[PDB]
Amino acid sequence: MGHHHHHHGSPEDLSLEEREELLDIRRRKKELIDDIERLKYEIAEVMTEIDNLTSVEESKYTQRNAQIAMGRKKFNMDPKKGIQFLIENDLLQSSPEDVAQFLYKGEGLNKTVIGDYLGERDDFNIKVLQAFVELHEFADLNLVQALRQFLWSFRLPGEAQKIDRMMEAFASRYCLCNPGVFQSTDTCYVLSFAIIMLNTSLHNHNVRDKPTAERFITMNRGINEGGDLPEELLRNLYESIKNEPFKIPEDDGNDLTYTFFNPDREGWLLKLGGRVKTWKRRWFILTDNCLYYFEYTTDKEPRGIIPLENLSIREVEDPRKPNCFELYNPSHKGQVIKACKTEADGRVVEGNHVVYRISAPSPEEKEEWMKSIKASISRDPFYDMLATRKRRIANKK
Amino acid sequence: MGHHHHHHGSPEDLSLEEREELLDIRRRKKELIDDIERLKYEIAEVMTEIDNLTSVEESKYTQRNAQIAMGRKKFNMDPKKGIQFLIENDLLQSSPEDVAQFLYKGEGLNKTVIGDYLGERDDFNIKVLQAFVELHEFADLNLVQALRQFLWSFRLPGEAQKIDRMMEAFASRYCLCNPGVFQSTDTCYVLSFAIIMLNTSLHNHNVRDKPTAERFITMNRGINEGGDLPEELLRNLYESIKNEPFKIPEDDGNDLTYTFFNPDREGWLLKLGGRVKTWKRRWFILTDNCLYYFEYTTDKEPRGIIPLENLSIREVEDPRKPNCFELYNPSHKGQVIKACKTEADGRVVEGNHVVYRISAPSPEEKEEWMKSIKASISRDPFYDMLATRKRRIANKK
Ligand SMILES: O=P(O)(O)O[C@H]1[C@H](O)[C@@H](OP(=O)(O)O)[C@H](OP(=O)(O)O)[C@@H](OP(=O)(O)O)[C@H]1O
Ligand SMILES: O=P(O)(O)O[C@H]1[C@H](O)[C@@H](OP(=O)(O)O)[C@H](OP(=O)(O)O)[C@@H](OP(=O)(O)O)[C@H]1O
Helix, strand or coil, rough: CCCCCCCCCCCCHHHHHHHHHHHHHHHHHHHHHHHHHHHHHHHHHHHHHHHHCCCCCCCCCHHHHHHHHHHHHHHHHHHHHHHHHHHHHCCCCHHHHHHHHHHHHCCCHHHHHHHHHHHHHHHCHHHHHHHHHCCCCCCCHHHHHHHHCCCCCCCCCCCCHHHHHHHHHHHHHHHCCCCCCCCCCHHHHHHHHHHHHHHHHCCCCCCCCCCHHHHHHHHHCCEEECCCCCHHHHHHHHHHHHHCCCCCCCCCCCCCCCCCCCCEEEEEEEEEEECCCEEEEEEEEEEEEEEEEECCCCCCCCEEEEEEECCCEEEECCCCCCCCCCCCCCCCCCCCCCCCCEEECCCCEEEECCCEEEEEECHHHHHHHHHHHHHHHHHHHHHHHHHHHHHHHHCCC | CCCCCCCCCCCCCCCHHHHHHHHHHHHHHHHHHHHHHHHCCCCCCCHHHHHHCCCCCCCCCHHHHHHHHHHHHHHHHHHHHHHHHHHHHHCCCHHHHHHHHHHHHHHCCCHHHHHHHHHHCHHHHHHHHHHHHHCCCCCCCCCHHHHHHHHCCCCCCCHHHHHHHHHHHHHHHHHHHCCCCCHHHHHHHHHHHHHHHHHHHHCCCCCCCCCCHHHHHCCCCCCCEEEEECCHHHHHHHHHHHHHCCCCCCCCCCCCCCCCCCEEEEEEEECCCCHHHHHHHEEEEEEEEEEEEECCCCCCCCCCCEECCCCCEEEEEECCCCCEEEECCCCCCCHHHHHHEECCCCCCCEEECCCCEEEEECHHHHHHHHHHHHHHHHHHHHHHHHHHHHHHHCCCC
16 A cells, blocks of 8 residues: 555545455455355254154165155156145145246156146146246347247147147247337247247258248248347347257157258149049149149149148159159058049049159159158148147238 | 242243254344444445545534434334425435335334334325335245244234235235245235234233144135145244244334234133023123124024123122123113123013123133133224135135
């Protein structure tokens, strides 16, 4: 420090000295706080000693640990029964909030089972799901950041209805934590699945079309209840996913986040006739789990419509045409597939196909079509869920 | 030895040693916290000294301190006027939140006056009460722990309506901080008063029936909107209160938490007739601030009903019967007490009593009855408040 002249008199107080004193006081306060923390720890230890009182002073094993361990295993076998066991035996309190804290901690818990339980339509489960999402702190996180945390805590159920409940809870929570970002919960929900599809698109090699940042901006046009979201916001989300894929717990490689494919496609194919086996070039549109085909790209009405429900694909070698596969019903051998087409006179009639043999222009287009068709068939209930949700997202005047 | 009344034993039955140690540790922690607060205050003073605006002063106390001191005294005289003085003179900002912070700090404030002010039905006061409970951090505290903090910050008003507002604010805050614990705010509210009655029961010597942990579990059956709360939860609450009574600020010994008696009782008594002074044994039920008496325990209809409104008790010596007291109206000497009874023919008529002389089977039963009756009369508006609240608690499925 050095000293000051001090001609003035004994009342002269020195700011530096006062500051130093203040610092010392602060240090003392910190020490006191540390002491308090230590005391708290001691108290906790005492409580532990008290609890499991009827025992031998030195016991080999831990009552609490043993009982909780068995309860967790019970939960993994049947979540309803596990929760019940833990509540009955006072290892867990009975409120939705306490159950949610148990699930969020998730120690020794199967995260798929967590997802199965949180996605149930029961009133208790609904309340646990709310408290569960409330344990996720979404304020000041972008949508991908929030999704990363949420998707670490459980594994998405397979049932479309269950996936919906959980993503609705997520979207509602995000919007409450980040007001003014999205115009509606519906916007947040649909954008969330856009992000999930992008994760699949960019990180699964079975997906050839790798969307650019500009492309992802264009795909989400009108999502904000008719309006567009800020380009900067969409870019940040795109770049986060591009940089790092969703990290999934207990990952089996089969997760929706990695295998959420676009079920829609358009393009030229040759198709073999039903009763009369002639090859025809047609413009095909795969949409709504149906294969629509047209004589010309300018036709308003399809030449035919093939519902894909209950069908599967097999590759075939054809004597004349390259890159062939067949659609067929594996349950109904030798039976006509339910479909409709238009005759030359304009009459709409039933198709006469036991199989639909299709030839693609290239091996690469063959693979694209088979992927799209398989994806469309395999996740239809889920794509239907999103489609019904997207309609309410789009607003008509 | 020998003492006059039957309520002084020896200290032999102690509590559990570990628990006592924990309590001591908690006390130490509290002391440390107080020390830290003092240090902080000192630091603030040092900062003020360092600061430029602070001149050397001829005066013992400074402008801010002097003005705030007078304002606090004004508040204690008339809370509305005190707040106004502090706001007008820029010693306190005008929002409910700032006023609530002033009240919560409570420096040099009468905590009874704090309670009077927070319990007012005015719109501003209602908003201050909300902000006041928001300054209490109830997350991860059990209901007793939260009650201890809340009941340190102010003294409960005497008006039933005011008590209701404050306990409603408390219960709502607790449930928001601890979601899923109680099924309703009503559950939290009624359980809170169960805890308060237990405090009186276990810690006031005028109360002979000391409920066990099992007893307290049984008393709260169906409280959770028809359902039962977890036995472990109720045990923790019971043991906390048993171990340590509610610590009340500026304690005069007259606080509700110490003098919240059960106003209800049943049992055998002899009663002296009205016009014709014959002694009859009757089964008595004290409920709803009324004394109902029956010829037989199996009777559906009472022999008579004595409203206790406006009555008081005096002990008397009787020539024939032991352990006697009289109910009488001190305002209406020599006048018949409003009551009803049934004649032998079944006609319901008015009673002819100037006084009701009652004889109890033992001195101990006499004391129990007089306590119950006095308690019932003295706090009727409040018991009525709880009763109307408990009805909405009991719901049908
Ligand atoms: O045009 P020609 O050479 O006469 O042969 C037709 C076309 O291949 C039709 O295809 P498209 O409808 O695309 O024109 C086909 O109908 P499908 O669409 O049902 O395959 C007819 O099947 P049958 O009606 O089953 O013979 C087949 O007779
Ligand atoms: O039975 P007997 O010996 O004839 O005397 C009766 C009983 O004592 C009654 O008590 P209870 O009603 O409990 O049977 C009492 O009524 P109260 O209930 O009003 O005390 C009558 O009072 P009067 O009616 O005031 O005389 C008194 O006449």
